[PDB]
Amino acid sequence: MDEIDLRILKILQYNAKYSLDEIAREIRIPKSTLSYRIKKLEKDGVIKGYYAYINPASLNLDYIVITSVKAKYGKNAHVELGNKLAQIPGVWGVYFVLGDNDFIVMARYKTREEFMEKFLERVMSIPEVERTSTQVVVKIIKESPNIVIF
Amino acid sequence: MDEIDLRILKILQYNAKYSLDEIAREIRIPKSTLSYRIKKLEKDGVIKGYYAYINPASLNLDYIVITSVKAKYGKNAHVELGNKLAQIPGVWGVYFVLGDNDFIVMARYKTREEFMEKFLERVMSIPEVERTSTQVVVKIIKESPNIVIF
Amino acid sequence: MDEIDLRILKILQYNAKYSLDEIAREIRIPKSTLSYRIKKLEKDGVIKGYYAYINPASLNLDYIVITSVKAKYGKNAHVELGNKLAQIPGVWGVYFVLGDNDFIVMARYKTREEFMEKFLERVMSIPEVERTSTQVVVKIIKESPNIVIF
Amino acid sequence: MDEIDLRILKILQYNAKYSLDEIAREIRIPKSTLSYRIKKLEKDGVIKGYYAYINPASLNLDYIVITSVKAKYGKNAHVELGNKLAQIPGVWGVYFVLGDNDFIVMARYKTREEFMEKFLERVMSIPEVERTSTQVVVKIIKESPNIVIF
Amino acid sequence: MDEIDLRILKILQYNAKYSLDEIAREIRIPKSTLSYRIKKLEKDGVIKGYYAYINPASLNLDYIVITSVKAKYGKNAHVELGNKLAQIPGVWGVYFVLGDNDFIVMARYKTREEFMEKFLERVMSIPEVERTSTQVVVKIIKESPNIVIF
Amino acid sequence: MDEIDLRILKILQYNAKYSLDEIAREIRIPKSTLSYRIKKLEKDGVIKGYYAYINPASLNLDYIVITSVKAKYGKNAHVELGNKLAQIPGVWGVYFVLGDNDFIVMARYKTREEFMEKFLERVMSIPEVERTSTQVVVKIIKESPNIVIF
Amino acid sequence: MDEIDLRILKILQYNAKYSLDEIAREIRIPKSTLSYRIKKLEKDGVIKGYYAYINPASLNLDYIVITSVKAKYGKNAHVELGNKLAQIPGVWGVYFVLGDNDFIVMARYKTREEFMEKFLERVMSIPEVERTSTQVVVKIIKESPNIVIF
Amino acid sequence: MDEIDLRILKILQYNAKYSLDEIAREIRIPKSTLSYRIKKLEKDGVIKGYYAYINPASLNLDYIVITSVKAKYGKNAHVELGNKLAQIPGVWGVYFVLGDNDFIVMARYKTREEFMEKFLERVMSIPEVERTSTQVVVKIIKESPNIVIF
Numbered sequence A, B, C, D, E, F, G, H: 001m002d003e004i005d006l007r008i009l010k011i012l013q014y015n016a017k018y019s020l021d022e023i024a025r026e027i028r029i030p031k032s033t034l035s036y037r038i039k040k041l042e043k044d045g046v047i048k049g050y051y052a053y054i055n056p057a058s059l060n061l062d063y064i065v066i067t068s069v070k071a072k073y074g075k076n077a078h079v080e081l082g083n084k085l086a087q088i089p090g091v092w093g094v095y096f097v098l099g100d101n102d103f104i105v106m107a108r109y110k111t112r113e114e115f116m117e118k119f120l121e122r123v124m125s126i127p128e129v130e131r132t133s134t135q136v137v138v139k140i141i142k143e144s145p146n147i148v149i150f
Ligand SMILES: NC(=O)CC[C@H](N)C(=O)O
Pocket: A021, A024, A025, A029, A030, A031, A032, A033
């Protein structure tokens, strides 16, 4: 892609509901060229899709957690655990990291009970889990993963 | 909102580019009622917007980090630091948490150098920062923050 | 319950040996209405009972400890351990928490020996216990769990 | 005190609303001797008072925390901090301990917001506070501080 | 024992090679009373013996270590480990403590090799040992365990 | 010194109250040669003195602690702190070590109060002290610093 | 060896491609004596060999790591693990240390993927490995192991 | 560079004292082409120089340390500290890393005293140093930084 695609993406990452006109007029190129470039970006998998950004509060997702998981070493344990963690309802982020913890898990729940029943109890029963340490998020100062071009 | 809104959102959180027909036909309600409900959800701020989901790899965002920041206690330090962290280019997530660290920062960069220059050096110069500990993400097993209804 | 019940409870949490007169006269309501409301609160389980507040020193409970317990992950280990900990003589508090430790145990003993024999040795033999870390309380600056309305 | 006082206290620590008859009949001594012994125990400060045991849930005290506080060393910092911590609304327990933390603070709040505003923000502004680490209690397996004789 | 015994012990803890005369003359009591009191203290096990204080340097005991040992929980593991640690040549101190470590071991060796072969390798093979962490002493600012009366 | 001195010291480190005869007869050398060698060892400072081994329990030294101290870096802080620690009554051991702590302090007191007043409060007021962490010794499995030849 | 050998080595550790003349003329000794001394040093194993110092960047060795490994205690585990770690491609340094970690491993790789596949995955499958913690080197301020005489 | 340069370097990294003949004959290319390629590699800075590999033991470098340094945050502290650390005699490695420590320092000394005087005391006086933690190397299982092509 070129500098022009970047300008297009920088817009779509913020607002995907702009008309081709508004975007074409802003970036200064013909609407048909824009439409082509956008379809192009999707074909090449640069743009994997379009989503509605839903306010978590609106769904009463008040119990936000960031859990560090240490896996029992050996075998294929790490790959297996990673996947078992990604399948848990409420978990939207699973990262394998370098440090004192193996995985960092991002999850959201409506309440403490939901969290205990849907996430904690489950994880504590997963075989390859050595230990977990959950940090409760008391305030989201920022959460805009959609902004990839800064 | 009602059970019907939930079904609508569960779709839009995955694919916001469905036609009113496809959605109306799936949920079994008239297209005009759907259109109204969607506009309604936006007005009430349930749906805050629509974004293009851009593949980070496509932008060579290879250096992914999860940094824990400890703030120097006192004054208005915490609120100030939180905000200074959210303004750093590449940082898309800033969380105030309960535990041994004050903030958890999610950031992405193309390379180690970009990371050092844009993020690390900056943060180490921020007054209210007592200490930082960065965990490098070697593998993203899952990152779908858009899925709020599970 | 209403604001009036709150005023009643705020008194009973401090001194349950006040006469109906003294309380009725303070809150400005008829003694029979008070008596009814109190019986009401007990029926609904708001007031679970009345206890004598006994000075621990008077019983030579000089060895006060706050022990963090880490459980071995898996199975039904956590629920089982929690219960085995609550049954140990001298233990009055058992909490399951989010952090690097699973349970926080509050206990009191007359001496170091009593502590070793009644608590430590027992806990170290409990199967589901991975590790324990005891913090000895050298000074109780405050311990008024009875004050729930502040 | 003697073995008889112990039997009396063991009862009062559980239920202070027993009639002199019921207690006198159980322990097998004359009601007047019992009444005297009880008044005696109060005079000597063994029994410091009687409280109503109020269910915290009934007051929506859902946010339970156990916070470790590290004080900045020097001066009279420790004594001062201990006291400033004991005065915070919602805090019912403050302990000075031997270990990696100076104080362990037990507090209860209705919600996360109340906790942030009444406790966290306050503590982070206290001068003699070096650091704090809060463990959120997700389950109270046991909390019977009233039971001193086991 | 009385204040007089204390004065006697305070002397013997520093220098056990004083004549009865010198001590008797200092404390102002008859030599025969002193001799009796000393024999008395030994009989009652107050004075368990007399030792020559040997300079460790003179024996080339240059490798001084303070090792923290964590035991595997369960069974009779703790008592067993404690004893196995006390039997290792070079180890003069073994303490069971409250904290994140179970035992603190004081040992001395002529060199790193002696330490590795006599202590480290041995301990790492002891079954009930979960982990060890050795802190090398680079400077003895003070080591006068003989001074019990200060 | 030679192998013979070693045999002599190995005896004196255990029992310094043996007669020259008993020792001379055991090691198989003339009493006058022994007496000379012993005086020799003292002159050369191999034997720095003779002490009475006093049972700490006999003096009610029940509160045994092992405290790790972290010093504030810079200046001549370390040397100064080391010395201030060695002067505290009850402290018999002070070690500068390699690890996460700067000094390891061995102390003994009759009670918790004595410990708080004589040691803790003092140390917390020492300027060059950054932090302290005290591990309470609940059991002395072994404490024979006098045994240097094993 | 003597002071002269030291001067020779101090040169060879920096530049082994100096002519015998240049070195002989600098240190002020006959070329034949120098040649002899150098051959001598090699025979005695003081000089174990000569290497070309290759710039790691030139080989795209961009992923530099320092990994701490904790071994499972018991048996011959430590010796075995040490050796298994030294055989891993990319690993140039393996150290057994005193502290909270057993081994410190120095390794270099071209990328994160190479690191994951060649080092991490391998190590996590090694039986005697209890845990690993990798610190990513973002900047080499200095790496001159060749300088032994300073 | 090409595959041929790699083969050349793979040899020179192990033994730089091979004749052009031996190398030319092994890799199967003309001696003049080899000589050219080698000079080429040096010009381009691939080969930065040739060193004698000196056995550290031969120089009595028995005290090997790996020290983690935490810097005081702010200003230009990190860059300054890094450089001050690299200038200390005996220090051959200084790395800025991601984790709980800022720098990892590799150093070697003949004895504990040399280490204390040349390294420790110096570092503890460096202003920008917050804390240091030294791990003593008791065994070098492997140290071949010269092997860059594996
Ligand atoms: N320029 C526009 O925005 C639309 C018309 C233009 N000719 C096109 O490419 O479609």
